[PDB]
């Protein structure tokens, strides 16, 4: 991995820095690195790609070294360098694609393609140099089992889940008390609905609770908490838990009462926020407990009083929402997020070449399936393919 | 059930709808039509029940599933009404002079009740909350009320002179009395001909619909003056001939049953649960 | 709360037993005692209700909660029996010539029945499954049946001539009729003075106990000839004096109520299954 | 950890090999390693801690080297070696005890005691040699980010749990349909009971399903599947879910029907066994799904036909049971098992010295609570203390 990353890093530096007219003193170290790469790779045969529709490509390296006598780079120098760079970039692209379309149950963190296995040998370790990208840096830290950190803008930490719980219900579905939530990506929208508006509740308070268990621990998380849930604030016709019939939801939104956000780690309270809306910080947690009350307003203007009668039929159902958005967080495992392209690149390569379903990943790289059952073997394979995808993105993209 | 009543139901908003359950519902359920005797008089036939059953049979109801129970009029039918079938459709004739009575019948039929015995001779009584009423039924109820105070002396009444009691009902076959809550009331009722019970309104009765034949919307099944709700089970039809009424009942039986549920039919046919 | 659905309940072994709840139930439950008239006659004491109430008070029950309901004889009590107390105990005197009638009464009150209305003048009736019976009660219920074939012609009877109908009940006050299943039967019933209903035996009624006074094991609360179960709620007592019988019933009331349970069909959990 | 293990292994080898009459060539490499250990430890002060009732102990090393020039070891040689060995064994045992009674939430795999942190310094790396035991080998492989596994005979993977689910029930508890189960250690006993014997069930079949979610993945697992559950095959009086009342269970055992045992990983079926009993192999799974059916016997002899009436009362309750015994398996993480003493050793040391409850483990190192909430921090601390316990077991 470090060798593949170093190859790609050298090639990217060469593309960016070996430019017409530049002082040789701008590239001397890069020229030495490029020549060391050429020397190490010369005389080695590689084969990439025998899975799915990925073609078998054979790679031979017999290149001359870049010169070192110039004081400024001229056009011919840059063109010969570009020829060598193009061949190497094609090779590195193919090696990355070959590694990305493979998985292993046993040592998913280890190389799977034969070319990367060969690049793991001692002779190639000379190529290794500056490992400064976040993914390769995390890779090297994880090899030594040092504390890793991946920064995610809008981490895709919640598998898609749009469901409801009914605490009070009956076959007519006209006096319903419960909760409905969409947990999707980096967002939790939840809403507690009482059809009676807590008319016969103990002191006119209806307590709602929602527990979200993250499959990985998040640290240093900026989170927006907004009082309302726009997703559960309009009329809906909803299937029953068995799917036999359909019930009606005609919500009227009241501000949630005694809102309490709890961020917990291993079932222990880490952060507690009471009546706090806007930006909050959850420093280290794996579970979110949102508790919030529907408080029947003691005083009502005539329209409000007409909304909520003393008894059934209840036409306007008292609903209190909450919206929770993880803006940015840190996780010790790789994750899909809104800003990066690692998952999209891995999925795109796997789909472009019709990679058959393997024993590790879901039937097509569905993120919901992966994150729902984010097992250690899956984590190892995903970190490997994501590091390879970033290495590829340094050059192909 | 009872050991899982207080447990959550979790459902996904992506589960597939089941097929139509109307066929199974009609094949396995009973339908009772309650109509006024004047209806059968106007029909004048003695086999019209068979014809209605056959016409229902085209709507999926098996043969021995629809039932026709006759009642004289609203007053007599209100004397301890008994609901027999899985679905009960009460064809009630409208009368401007019996509005409240109709409402009371509706209130006793479209809502579920839980009633305890009342002994008006040995005890004073009060209505705890807005769901607590006094429902009395029988040949003729004459309810007179004497409100008391904290000292248990009457207000505008004398505990010994019943003639000073405030009358709230006279010659009633069914009356639901709502008095001021938190006040002990001495009660005078003609217990010989009718019985009074302290009842609590639990909730709707989903298996009984009331079709008002003629008139306008006058039903008021809630004592609260600020609400006069018209539920899905409270229908109204303009009419000139009873055959048309029965035909519109039969043809749109699907719409009628859609407004009802088959989850309120109790073991006994009484319009109220009774506890001692 | 989740009334219309049966959610599974998970229980853990090693969960500690709650304390005895017998005192609380005695303090919050009503005990109706049913006895024949001859019992009151032989006792011959107009104050015996007060004495029994005080004895029960010694045994736990508050002295306003035990009820004594008198019936004339087994046959009369079987007409529309109504057991409204939390716990009902019936002292049923034994007669060697009334074995079937005692069995029918016990079957009617020791088990829960869901009865649909029967219109024998409108429909041919058939019994679907082994749990489906025809229960008829009244002052005098005489029932004759004509089993029909697939072509609707009668078998061993003529539908037009009722005199040929096979007679299954004569001048009965209560009769549970069981016929072959899946065969439509035309019914000739003295509907003028007795009601017949198409009933299903849902299951036991656990709040009603029957003590057979001075007989032998004869009750058969199941129509299957191969089963004659003796449930815990059908006791038997030898007797010479009714005072000793009442004293035994009071002294062993703990055991008696142990053999019973709160009516499962009753109470809020049963809501939307059949009743409350 | 590697250094502590090397110290212990050196001492164990010296005890086993430095014996009277033995050829020096039998022990020459060991003597070189022992002298290297002495040289590396000489001049260093150590303090084993005062946590709990474990006393504060100070350790000093000013030992001479063992001789190298005899053809055969003699009695003098053995006595001289034993003097140094005893002190080193005492020191290593105390370091192991000090490390076994400590825990950390942030970094539970790293050493916790001062002595083991001092021994992780580069100046002690010379002591390190053959790391051949399963626990130290796993430790090194895991530090190398390498796939390694612990082998367990009868792994204690299931938290103790004796519970039941009633899918059909009533307040009188006389027509009950449900499941009874004991998950204990490496054993699962499950039983579906129907009181009506599926008299009124579709096709006269009652389906039972029991899912056990293992807290860690198991691999190459040898499992015995037996078609009955003797734990739920005799009359019982059982509390109710709230304990308000007690109900009655009167089993009559029928053969379970359509027995399907699935071993699943990430919700996907890895292994499936249909109507197979005896030895089966679950190659890699985190969940066990047991489906079975109570099938009403279509034909019954009169004695059988009596037991199952058409309706209530039901006196003989038809029960079908399965039993699943994990004989052997492999886990990435550490676990208690019927063979190894790591858990017992750690618990014993924690009990003998009145070690208070820490922020990692449950009080008393109780295995049910520990395996129920097997968090990563708990896993790290527990592997650390188990490796230290094995290292201590080499000598104590
Ligand atoms: C529902 O209807 C569809 C279409 O007629 C049919 O395929 C299906 O089998 C029916 N039953 C169920 C349970 O879906
Ligand atoms: C139950 O009984 C025990 C022992 O008699 C007593 O300590 C306890 O207070 C009682 N009450 C409850 C509610 O457990
Ligand atoms: Ca007056
Ligand atoms: Ca009236
Ligand atoms: Ca009132
Ligand atoms: Ca009103
Ligand atoms: Ca009889
Ligand atoms: Ca005949
Ligand atoms: Ca029959
Ligand atoms: Ca029998
Ligand atoms: Zn629902
Ligand atoms: Zn129970």
Collect all residues with Cβ–Cβ distance below 8 Å to B233 and sequence separation of at least 6.
Answer: B110, B204, B206, B208, B209, B210, B259, B260
Residue the block writes with tokens 């949102």:
A290
- Contact (CB, 8 A) for D190 and D163: no
Q: In C101-116, which positions are buried (b, 16+ CB within 10 angstroms) versus exposed (e)?
A: bbbbbbbbbbbbbbbb
Residue C168 CA, ligand 9 centroid: distance in Å:
13
Q: What does A46-89 look like in DSSP terms, one character per residue?
A: EEE--STTPPPEEEE---PPPP---SB--HHHHHHHHHHHHHHH
Q: Can you tell me whether residue D303 is helix, strand or coil?
A: helix
Q: What is the rounded distance in angstroms from the CA atom of residue A362 to the CA atom of residue A349?
A: 15
Side-chain half-sphere CA neighbours of A224 within 13 A: 12
Q: What is the rounded distance in angstroms from the CA atom of residue C197 to the CA atom of residue C200?
A: 10
CA dihedral B120, B122, B128, B131 (to 10 degrees): -30
Q: Provide the 10 A C-beta neighbour count for residue D117.
A: 12
Cα angle, residue B112 at apex, residues B49 and A309 outer, rounded to 5°:
120
Q: Which of A109, A142, A373 sits opposite D266 (nearest CB)?
A: A373
- Contact (CB, 8 A) for A378 and A334: no
Q: Do D267 and A372 touch (CB under 8 A)?
A: yes
D116: enclosing H helix or E strand = helix D114-119
Tell me, rounded to whole angstroms, the distance of Cα D26 from its chain centroid: 37
Burial class (CB in 10 A: 0-12, 13-18, 19+), B31: buried
Q: Identify the CA nearest to C212 among candidates C258, C249, C177, C175.
A: C249
A97: enclosing H helix or E strand = helix A75-100
Token code pair at residue C268? 């809020």
- Contact (CB, 8 A) for A11 and A85: yes
Q: In B3-20, which positions are buried (b, 16+ CB within 10 angstroms) versus exposed (e)?
A: bbbeebbebeeeeeeeee
Q: What is the rounded distance in angstroms from the CA atom of residue D323 to the CA atom of residue D280?
A: 13
Q: What does D321-360 look like in DSSP terms, one character per residue?
A: EEEEEEEEEEESS---BSS--HHHHHHHHHHHTTPPP-SS
Beta bridge pairs of residue A46: A59
Residues of C near D (Cβ–Cβ under 8 Å) read: 6, 8-18, 21, 130-131, 201, 203-204, 206, 222, 224, 226-227, 229, 231, 261-262, 264
Q: Do B263 and C30 touch (CB under 8 A)?
A: no
Cα angle, residue D375 at apex, residues C10 and D373 outer, rounded to 5°:
25
Which residues does chain B have within 8 Å of residue C269's beta carbon, measured at their own beta carbons? Answer: 1-2, 5
Q: What does A300-350 look like in DSSP terms, one character per residue?
A: --HHHHHHS-SSS---SEEEEEEEEEEEEEEESS---BSS--HHHHHHHHH
Burial class (CB in 10 A: 0-12, 13-18, 19+), B242: buried
**Backbone CA torsion sign across C245, C247, C248, C249:** positive
- Contact (CB, 8 A) for C17 and D239: yes
Chain A nearest-CA residue for D149: A106
Q: What is the rounded distance in angstroms from the CA atom of residue D251 to the CA atom of residue D235?
A: 6
- Contact (CB, 8 A) for C275 and B268: yes
Long-range contacts of A198-205 (CB under 8 A, 24+ apart): A198/A294, A198/A295, A198/A296, A198/A318, A199/A296, A199/A308, A199/A309, A199/A310, A199/A311, A201/A296, A204/A295, A204/A296, A204/A298, A205/A257, A205/A293, A205/A294, A205/A295, A205/A296
Q: Do B64 and C32 touch (CB under 8 A)?
A: no
Token code pair at residue C260? 């019973």
Chain D nearest-CA residue for C258: D172
Axis-axis angle for helices A134-143, A376-395 (nearest 10): 140
Ligand nearest to the CA of A248: 11
For chain B, say whether A302 makes contact (Cβ under 8 Å): no
For chain C, say whether B41 makes contact (Cβ under 8 Å): no
Tell me, rounded to whole angstroms, the distance of Cα D101 from its chain centroid: 19
Resolution in A: 2.4
Q: Do C6 and D164 touch (CB under 8 A)?
A: no
Collect all residues with Cβ–Cβ distance below 8 Å to D300 and sequence separation of at least 6.
Answer: D308
Residue D295 CA, ligand 1 centroid: distance in Å:
27
- Contact (CB, 8 A) for D37 and D11: no
Chain A interface test: which of D145, D217, D264, D330 (most A C-beta within 10 Å): D145
Which residues does chain A have within 8 Å of residue B10's beta carbon, measured at their own beta carbons? Answer: 163-166, 241
Which residues does chain C have within 8 Å of residue D176's beta carbon, measured at their own beta carbons? Answer: none
- Contact (CB, 8 A) for A360 and A374: no
Q: What does B44-104 look like in DSSP terms, one character per residue?
A: --SSHHHHHHHHHHTTT--GGGEEEEEES-HHHHTSS-B--SSEEEEEEE--GGGHHHHHH
Which residues does chain B have within 8 Å of residue C202's beta carbon, measured at their own beta carbons? Answer: 267
Residue the block writes with tokens 């008070």:
C57
Q: Do B5 and C269 touch (CB under 8 A)?
A: yes
- Contact (CB, 8 A) for A183 and A368: no
Which residues does chain C have within 8 Å of residue D166's beta carbon, measured at their own beta carbons? Answer: 8-11
- Contact (CB, 8 A) for D148 and D141: yes
Token code pair at residue A240? 């029953």
Phi, psi angle pair for C228, to nearest 5°? -135, 70
Phi, psi angle pair for C275, to nearest 5°? -135, 140
**Backbone CA torsion sign across A122, A128, A131, A136:** negative
Q: How far is D241 from chain B (nearest CA, A)?
A: 8
Q: Provide the 10 A C-beta neighbour count for residue D212.
A: 17
Residue C18 CA, ligand 2 centroid: distance in Å:
8
Q: Can you tell me whether residue A237 is helix, strand or coil?
A: strand
Residue D238 CA, ligand 12 centroid: distance in Å:
9
Residue D198 CA, ligand 5 centroid: distance in Å:
51
Burial class (CB in 10 A: 0-12, 13-18, 19+), C118: buried
- Contact (CB, 8 A) for D91 and D367: no
Side-chain half-sphere CA neighbours of B191 within 13 A: 10
Q: Can you tell me whether residue A95 is helix, strand or coil?
A: helix
Query: What's the 3-state SS for chain C?
Result: CECCCCCCEEEECCCCCCCCCHHHHHHHCCEEEEEEHHHHHHHCCCCHHHHHHHHHHHHCCCCCCEEEEEECCHHHHCCCCCCCCCEEEEEEECCCCCHHHHHHHHHHHCEEEEEEECCCCCCCECECCCCEEEEEEEEEEEEEEEEECCCCCECCCCCCCHHHCEEEEEEEEEEEECCCECCCEEEEECHHHEEEEEEEEEEECCCEEEEEECCCCCCCCCCCCCCCCCCCCEEEECCCCHHHHHHHHHHCHHHHHHCCCCCCCCCHHHCCCCCC
Cα angle, residue D374 at apex, residues D372 and D377 outer, rounded to 5°:
150
For chain C, say whether A166 makes contact (Cβ under 8 Å): yes
Binding site residue list of B for Ca(2+): 45, 127, 156, 164, 166, 178-179, 181, 251
For chain C, say whether B69 makes contact (Cβ under 8 Å): yes
Residues of B near D (Cβ–Cβ under 8 Å) read: 1-4
Q: Can you tell me whether residue A109 is helix, strand or coil?
A: coil
Q: Provide the 10 A C-beta neighbour count for residue D295.
A: 20
Beta bridge pairs of residue D326: D223
Q: Which of residues 116-145 of A touch D (CB under 8 A)?
A: 142-143, 145
Phi, psi angle pair for D40, to nearest 5°? -70, -30
Which residues does chain A have within 8 Å of residue B11's beta carbon, measured at their own beta carbons? Answer: 163-166, 238-242
For chain C, say whether A176 makes contact (Cβ under 8 Å): no
Binding site residue list of A for Ca(2+): 266, 286
Q: What is the rounded distance in angstroms from the CA atom of residue D184 to the CA atom of residue D159?
A: 6
Residue B238 CA, ligand 6 centroid: distance in Å:
23
End-to-end CA distance of chain A: 19
- Contact (CB, 8 A) for B273 and B108: no
- Contact (CB, 8 A) for D123 and D43: no
CA dihedral B135, B141, B142, B145 (to 10 degrees): -20
Residue B170 CA, ligand 4 centroid: distance in Å:
8
Token code pair at residue D384? 């650390």
End-to-end CA distance of chain B: 25
Integer angstrom CA distances of residue B30 from C118, C183, D254, D330: 11, 20, 39, 61
- Contact (CB, 8 A) for D134 and D386: no
Q: Identify the CA nearest to D119 among candidates D128, D130, D109.
A: D128
Q: How far is B176 from chain A (nearest CA, A)?
A: 17
Q: What is the rounded distance in angstroms from the CA atom of residue D226 to the CA atom of residue D278?
A: 6
- Contact (CB, 8 A) for A188 and A321: no
Residue the block writes with tokens 């985190």:
D286
Side-chain half-sphere CA neighbours of C121 within 13 A: 11
Q: What is the rounded distance in angstroms from the CA atom of residue A197 to the CA atom of residue A296?
A: 6
Q: What is the rounded distance in angstroms from the CA atom of residue D312 to the CA atom of residue D315?
A: 8
Q: What is the DSSP letter of D123?
A: G
Collect all residues with Cβ–Cβ distance below 8 Å to A301 and sequence separation of at least 6.
Answer: none
- Contact (CB, 8 A) for D383 and D88: no
Q: What is the DSSP letter of A169?
A: B
- Contact (CB, 8 A) for B178 and B127: yes
Q: What does A240-284 look like in DSSP terms, one character per residue?
A: -TTSSSEEEE-EEE---EEEEEEEESSSSEEEEEES--EEEEEEE
Q: What is the DSSP letter of B263?
A: S
Burial class (CB in 10 A: 0-12, 13-18, 19+), B105: buried
Ligand-binding site membership of C164 (annotated):
yes
- Contact (CB, 8 A) for B260 and B87: yes
Q: What is the rounded distance in angstroms from the CA atom of residue B238 to the CA atom of residue A34?
A: 95
Token code pair at residue A49? 């790609």
Beta bridge pairs of residue C69: C34
Chain D nearest-CA residue for C264: D171
Chain B nearest-CA residue for D243: B3
Tell me, rounded to whole angstroms, the distance of Cα D24 from its chain centroid: 41
Integer angstrom CA distances of residue D11 from B203, D94, D394: 81, 14, 9
Q: What does D196-261 look like in DSSP terms, one character per residue?
A: STTTTSGGGEEEEEEEEEEEEEEEEEEEEEES--GGGSS-EEEE-TTSSSEEEE-EEE---EEEEE
Q: How far is A269 from chain B (nearest CA, A)?
A: 25
Q: Write down how long chain D is.
A: 396
Phi, psi angle pair for B22, to nearest 5°? -75, -40
Residue C157 CA, ligand 8 centroid: distance in Å:
4
Chain D nearest-CA residue for A370: D266
Phi-psi category of D201—alpha, beta or left, where left has phi over 0 and alpha has psi -120 to 50?
Answer: beta
Q: Which of C201, C229, C262 sits opposite D171 (nearest CB)?
A: C262
Q: What does D65-109 look like in DSSP terms, one character per residue?
A: PPP---SB--HHHHHHHHHHHHHHHHHHHHHHHHHHT---SS-SS
Collect all residues with Cβ–Cβ distance below 8 Å to D88 and sequence separation of at least 6.
Answer: D7, D10, D11, D37, D41
- Chains near B (3 or more Cβ pairs under 8 Å): A, C, D
Task: Give the max Cα distance, chain D.
Answer: 93
Integer angstrom CA distances of residue C232 from C26, C59, C88, C216, C229: 20, 21, 14, 15, 10
Integer angstrom CA distances of residue A42 from A65, A86, A125, B139, C20: 10, 16, 14, 113, 89
Q: Do B263 and A178 touch (CB under 8 A)?
A: no
Integer angstrom CA distances of residue C74 from C38, C96, C249, D344: 12, 13, 19, 72
Tell me, rounded to whole angstroms, the distance of Cα B69 from its chain centroid: 15
Token code pair at residue A375? 């097992």
The DSSP bridge pattern shows strands B87-93 and B31-36 to be: parallel
For chain C, say whether A229 makes contact (Cβ under 8 Å): no
Which residues does chain A have within 8 Å of residue C1's beta carbon, measured at their own beta carbons? Answer: 167-169, 177
Q: Provide the 10 A C-beta neighbour count for residue A318.
A: 25
CA dihedral A250, A256, A259, A261 (to 10 degrees): 40
Q: What is the DSSP letter of D155?
A: B
Phi, psi angle pair for B184, to nearest 5°? -75, 125
Q: What is the rounded distance in angstroms from the CA atom of residue B129 to the CA atom of residue A19?
A: 89
- Contact (CB, 8 A) for B188 and B75: no
């Amino acid at each position: 991995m470090d060798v593949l990353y170093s190859l790609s890093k050298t090639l990217k530096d060469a593309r960016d820095k070996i430019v017409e007219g530049t002082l040789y003193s701008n590239v001397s170290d890069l020229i030495q690195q490029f020549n060391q790469m050429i020397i190490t790779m010369n005389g080695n045969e590689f084969q990439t790609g025998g899975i799915g529709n990925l073609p078998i490509r054979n790679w031979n390296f017999d290149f001359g070294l870049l010169g070192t006598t110039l004081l400024n780079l001229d056009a011919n120098y840059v063109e010969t360098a570009r020829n060598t760079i193009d061949y190497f970039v094609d090779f590195v692209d193919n090696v990355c694609m070959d590694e990305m379309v493979r998985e292993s149950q046993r040592n998913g963190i280890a190389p799977q393609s034969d070319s990367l296995r060969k690049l793991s040998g001692i002779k190639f370790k000379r190529i290794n140099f500056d490992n400064s990208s976040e993914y390769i840096e995390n890779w090297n830290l994880q090899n030594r089992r040092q504390r890793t950190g991946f920064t995610f803008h809008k981490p895709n930490i919640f598998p898609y889940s749009a469901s409801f719980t009914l605490n009070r219900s009956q076959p007519a579905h006209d006096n319903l008390m419960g909760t409905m939530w969409l947990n999707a990506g980096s967002e939790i929208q939840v809403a507690g609905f009482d059809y009676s508006c807590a008319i016969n509740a103990p002191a006119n308070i209806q307590q709602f609770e929602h527990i979200v268990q993250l499959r990985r621990v998040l640290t240093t998380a900026t989170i927006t908490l907004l009082p309302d849930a726009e997703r559960f604030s309009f009329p809906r016709v909803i299937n029953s838990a068995d799917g036999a019939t359909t019930w009606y939801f005609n919500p009227v939104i009241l501000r949630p009462n005694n809102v309490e956000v709890e961020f917990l780690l291993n079932g222990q309270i880490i952060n507690t926020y009471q009546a706090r809306f806007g930006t909050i910080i959850a420093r280290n947690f794996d579970t979110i407990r949102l508790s919030f009350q529907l408080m029947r307003p003691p005083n009502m203007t005539p329209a409000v009083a007409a909304l909520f009668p003393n008894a059934q039929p209840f036409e306007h159902h008292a609903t209190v929402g909450l919206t929770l958005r993880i803006e940015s967080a840190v996780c010790e495992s790789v994750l899909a997020d809104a800003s990066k392209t690692m998952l999209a690149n891995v999925t795109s390569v796997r789909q472009e070449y019709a990679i058959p379903v393997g024993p590790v990943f879901p039937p097509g790289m569905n993120w919901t399936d992966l994150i729902t059952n984010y097992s250690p073997s899956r984590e190892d394979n995903l970190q490997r393919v994501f590091t390879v995808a970033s290495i590829r993105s340094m050059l192909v993209k | 059930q009872n050991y899982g009543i207080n447990l959550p139901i979790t459902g996904s908003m992506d589960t597939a709808y089941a097929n139509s359950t109307q066929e199974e519902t009609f094949l396995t359920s009973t339908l009772c039509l309650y109509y006024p005797t004047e209806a059968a008089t106007e029909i004048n036939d003695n086999s019209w029940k068979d014809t209605l059953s056959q016409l229902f049979l085209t709507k999926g109801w098996p043969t021995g599933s629809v039932y026709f129970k006759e009642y004289t009029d609203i007053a007599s039918f209100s004397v301890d009404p008994q609901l027999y079938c899985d679905y009960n459709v009460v064809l009630m004739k409208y009368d401007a002079t019996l509005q409240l009575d109709m409402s009371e019948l509706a209130d006793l039929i479209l809502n579920e009740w839980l009633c305890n015995p009342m002994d008006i001779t040995l005890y004073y009584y009060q209505q705890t909350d807005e769901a607590n009423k006094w429902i009395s039924m029988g040949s003729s109820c004459t309810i007179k009320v004497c409100p008391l105070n904290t000292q248990t002396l009457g207000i505008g009444c004398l505990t010994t002179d019943t003639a000073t009691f405030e009358e709230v009902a006279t010659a009633e076959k069914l009356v639901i009395t709502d008095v001021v809550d938190g006040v002990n009331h001495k009660l005078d009722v003609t217990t010989a001909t009718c019985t009074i019970r302290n009842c609590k309104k639990l909730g709707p009765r989903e298996n009984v619909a009331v079709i008002q034949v003629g008139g306008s919307d006058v039903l008021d099944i809630t004592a609260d003056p600020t609400t006069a709700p018209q539920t899905e089970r409270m229908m109204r039809i303009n009419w000139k001939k009873w055959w048309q009424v029965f035909y519109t009942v039969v043809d749109y039986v699907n719409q009628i049953i859609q407004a009802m549920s088959k989850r309120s039919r109790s073991l006994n046919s009484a319009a109220f649960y009774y506890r001692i």
